[PDB]
Design a protein around this nucleic acid. Structure first.
Ligand SMILES: [Mn+2]
Ligand SMILES: [Mn+2]
Ligand code: NA
Length: 346
DNA sequence: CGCTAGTCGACAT
DNA sequence: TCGACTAGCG
């Protein structure tokens, strides 16, 4: 996500407990519980030996929310975004490297250092995620699979009024424009809340509290979609948007050396990547739970051409998008691996 | 001070 | 995977 963003807007945060959302709906970035639950059984998972410790880990987090009168909607990552296939492969190479080197550290004798190797090789698969789906649906807990990144799907559920808060550990939710983000929640509900309107409490943030300017700031500092220019962090990027009274962000990026008084050369392909990064934060395909239709995160503006937004995900038939979101259709093989039906009893 | 890139812990015995 | 945390550099 946006590295250093949580310490950058710490004034907007407030330690809370999940009881303040009793009787309300809260969506969950379930891949954070999946990863932390897999750390306990990272050895068996890396060895291919059967294990299901992570499911019980994810369930007590769900049972904790159900004990406090909260309706959780579990959201899971779906297809890989087209602009991150090279990134996912390079991360897969590191998982295979720490796996092979981890098995060699066991051959050498050290296990305390091999433990740190197997835990960095954890690959949360869709089969592991579907195990949590069947375990949660057996407890009457709703489950949903995002068309692509769960980051965008969560941002839609919060901005549409379906949920009022989002439990996660990732800071991309703030850049996507969420209303209430709950970070660092333990097994007991002790968390740290960040609201969107409460971003004004950050003095160093300046007038970059509006969603459009704040989204531009997160991108210029570097994100999953576009690396930052060397020497451009969160503070200097925030200074650019403060010192720039120009609404056109394109001319501002070209003058990034004028606002900061630095010799910064802006390549021409960086502008295109920025536009691709902004359109991805804005128009990434999510799944409407009510209407059951593929929609962008935000409604298409009259200036953008939706035909040139393939990097934000391509459309499929709504009947296929429904089965993918229900976890019945495999993300890879597109074959029916389940037959869940929510009608016969979001 | 700000930014880069690296280290390291998470879980739970 | 994601963050917190720090030495090193402008
Ligand atoms: Mn993310
Ligand atoms: Mn994510
Ligand atoms: Na940066």
């Amino acid at each position: 996500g946006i590295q250093g963003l949580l310490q950058f807007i710490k004034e907007a945060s407030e330690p809370i407990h999940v009881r303040k959302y009793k009787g309300q709906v809260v969506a969950v970035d379930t891949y954070c519980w999946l990863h932390k639950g897999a750390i306990a059984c990272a050895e068996k998972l890396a060895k291919g030996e059967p294990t299901d410790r992570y499911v019980g880990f994810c369930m007590k987090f769900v049972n904790m929310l159900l004990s406090h009168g909260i309706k959780p909607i579990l959201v899971f990552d779906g297809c890989t975004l087209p602009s991150k296939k090279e990134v996912e492969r390079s991360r897969r190479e590191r998982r295979q490297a720490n796996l092979l080197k981890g098995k060699q550290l066991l051959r050498e004798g050290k296990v305390s250092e091999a433990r740190e190797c197997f835990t960095r090789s954890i690959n949360i698969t869709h089969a592991m995620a579907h195990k949590v789906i069947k375990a949660a649906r057996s407890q009457g807990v709703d489950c949903l699979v995002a068309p692509y990144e769960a980051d965008a799907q969560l941002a839609y559920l919060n901005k549409a009024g379906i949920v009022q808060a989002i439990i996660t550990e990732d800071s991309d939710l703030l850049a996507f424009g969420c209303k209430k983000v709950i970070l660092k929640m333990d097994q007991f509900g002790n968390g740290l809340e960040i609201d969107q309107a409460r971003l004004g409490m950050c003095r160093q943030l300046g007038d970059v509290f509006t969603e459009e300017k704040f989204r531009y700031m997160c991108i210029l500092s570097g994100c999953d979609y576009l690396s930052s220019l060397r020497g451009i962090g969160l503070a200097k990027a925030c200074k650019v948007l403060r010192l720039a009274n120009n609404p056109d962000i394109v001319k501002v990026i070209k003058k990034i050396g004028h606002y900061l008084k630095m010799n910064i050369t802006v390549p021409e392909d960086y502008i295109n990547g920025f536009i691709r990064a902004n359109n991805t934060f804005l128009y990434q395909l999510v799944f409407d739970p009510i209407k059951r239709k593929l929609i962008p995160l935000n409604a298409y503006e009259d200036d953008v051409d939706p035909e040139t937004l393939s990097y934000a995900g391509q459309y499929v038939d709504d009947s296929i998008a429904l089965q993918i979101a229900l976890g019945n259709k495999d993300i890879n093989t597109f074959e029916q691996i389940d037959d869940y039906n929510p009608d016969t009893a979001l």
